[PDB]
Every structure is written in structure tokens, then in C-alpha cells.
């Protein structure tokens, strides 16, 4: 019983964090094989105007770097741009490099953040990519380069390196190809996130987890079809549901079909009336069907 946002264990990723310093800048890098990846704004010399990174790379002095894993310093062999990242070749292979892949995540998908400072992991928590390609993170100065990851069958899938905070406190990173999520710029400019819609498939997973945990006060016999729900959604900050197949086994272990939950969502979207669902007083879209399945049943 119970539902908690949790992280997958971080041990295999902790061995890959390094400290990357250049001039007055300090942030984190990811050391895989003989390469260190880090945000390219570590070689920026200003914090207000817009930076010509290609120029900053052209006048770089390789010896002004300090890259360290604990008290082990890594010598820099070369540096090339990889989108919003630097790909730094170093003179030592990380022997504790895990089996790993890169993947770019999509809105609604969950992953793990390893929040790092001074090249050392400090905290680990789960996040979910919002429709405006931001995450609900907790990062302060020095967190850039903190990685986001999932673990499947012992392979680490890296999907995020932290870059920046938007003017509201939303957090933005790049994938490991150096492509910024949501097309935000890795510049200190005025850019505003788009509006964030609640991901309806995730809200449904949360409500099925509530039913499995014995929370049923918000459920009724009232019912609404997918199509009638999708028309209300676009005027009420929620996404449309298109495939309900992922909810088949949920409806089978609880006896409650999606259409009933969709009608409950409409009532709950305003308020819970002073009541709570698994501790929440607002709908949450941070849980995927996959997370719920694992926590509810281990599969």
C-alpha cells in the first residue's frame, strides 16, 4: 500500500559525476569512458549579455580547466561543442562507467534527477517532463550538469543534463545530444515557458492508484465518454486522452473503467472540497501508469 514519488537507486550514476571548473564558473559534468559532458556555459565569461559560444571556444585555454572526480584530477585532451554541451576528451577512462544509452524523453515521461554540487551527488528525486518541456525541480547555483536518468535491466538511460532556471522557477535541461528541451536557449535571456497542461493519462494512473489503496469517496457512477471529455479538457488546462488501452489491466483489477474516472476528474479539477486523495488536495500528473504498476504490484 501507499504511493510515493521515488527515484531509482543512484549508485551506478554517482560514480560518473565530476566537478568541471573554468575561470569563475563551476558546475558538474558526466564522465563516461574517456569523455566528460557538461553544459557549455561553463566557458562563458559574462552573465548578462548573450554569449558567442563559438568565440568562447576559440579562445579557450585547455589548462584553465580543472576537472576532478573526488581528489582525482583529469587531464583535458580536447574540447568540442555538442549543441548546448561541451564534449571534453580527458586522458583517463572511467573504469566504473556503466552500460548506458542516450534517449530524449517526451512530455509526460518520468525520470530521475541526481542533484549535484561541486561534482558530488547531493540528492536524488523523481520528476516528470511537463508539456512545456520544464520540470518541477529543486536546483540552486552550481547544479548545472546534474544528470537525469532511468535504469532498465541494468542499462542507464541518460536523458537530461541540467542547464537553467526560467524566470518563474521552472527548470530546463538539454538531452545528452546537446539539444535543449522545449527549444529554450542556453542564454540569460527573457524567455517564458508555455502554459502547462495536466497530462491526463498520468492523472488517471494516480486515480487508479488511489482506488487500489482504498480511496473511493471521489468516485461515482457518473460517466463521460472520451470525446466529451476531450472537448472539456482543451478549455480546462488538461490534455486529451487518445488511447485508453494502457488502462485495461487497471480497470480489470479495480472494476472501474476510464469513463468513470474521467467524470471524477471534471469534479475534482476545481477542488477536493477540503478532502484529500493519498494526501493530495489537487490533481497530480507526476505519476505514469508504469510507476503505478511497479509500486502497486512489483511488475
Amino acid at each position: 500500500a501507499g504511493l510515493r514519488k521515488m527515484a531509482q537507486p543512484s549508485g551506478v550514476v554517482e560514480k560518473c559525476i565530476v566537478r568541471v571548473c573554468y575561470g569563475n564558473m563551476a558546475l558538474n559534468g558526466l564522465w563516461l569512458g574517456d569523455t566528460v559532458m557538461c553544459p557549455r556555459h561553463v566557458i562563458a565569461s559574462s552573465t548578462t549579455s548573450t554569449i558567442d559560444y563559438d568565440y568562447a571556444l576559440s579562445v579557450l585555454r585547455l589548462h584553465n580547466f580543472s576537472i576532478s572526480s573526488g581528489n582525482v584530477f583529469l587531464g583535458v585532451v580536447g574540447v568540442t561543442m555538442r549543441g548546448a554541451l561541451l564534449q571534453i576528451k580527458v586522458n583517463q577512462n572511467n573504469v566504473h562507467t556503466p552500460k548506458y544509452t542516450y534517449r530524449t524523453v517526451r512530455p509526460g515521461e518520468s525520470f530521475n534527477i541526481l542533484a549535484c554540487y561541486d561534482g558530488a551527488a547531493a540528492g536524488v528525486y523523481g520528476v516528470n517532463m511537463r508539456s512545456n518541456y520544464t520540470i518541477r525541480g529543486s536546483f540552486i547555483n552550481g547544479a548545472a550538469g546534474s544528470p537525469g536518468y532511468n535504469i532498465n535491466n541494468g542499462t542507464v538511460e541518460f536523458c537530461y543534463l541540467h542547464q537553467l532556471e526560467l524566470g518563474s522557477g521552472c527548470h530546463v535541461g538539454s538531452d545528452l545530444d546537446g539539444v535543449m528541451y522545449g527549444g529554450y536557449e542556453d542564454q540569460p535571456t527573457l524567455q517564458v515557458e508555455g502554459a502547462s497542461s495536466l497530462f491526463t493519462e498520468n492523472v488517471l494512473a494516480f486515480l487508479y492508484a488511489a482506488l487500489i489503496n482504498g480511496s473511493t469517496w471521489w468516485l461515482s457512477s457518473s460517466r463521460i465518454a472520451v470525446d466529451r471529455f476531450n472537448e472539456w479538457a482543451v478549455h480546462n488546462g488538461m490534455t486529451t486522452v487518445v488511447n485508453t488501452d494502457c488502462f485495461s489491466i487497471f480497470a480489470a483489477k479495480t472494476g472501474v473503467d476510464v469513463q468513470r474516472l474521467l467524470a471524477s476528474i471534471q469534479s475534482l479539477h476545481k477542488n477536493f472540497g477540503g478532502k484529500q486523495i493519498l494526501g493530495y488536495t489537487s490533481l497530480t500528473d507526476e505519476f505514469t501508469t508504469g510507476e503505478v504498476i511497479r509500486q502497486m504490484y512489483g511488475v
Partner: peptide, 5 residues
């Protein structure tokens, strides 16, 4: 206003 971290 973007803040690099």
C-alpha cells in the same frame, strides 16, 4: 528571465 545555474 533565464538564470544559468
Amino acid at each position: 528571465r533565464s538564470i544559468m545555474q
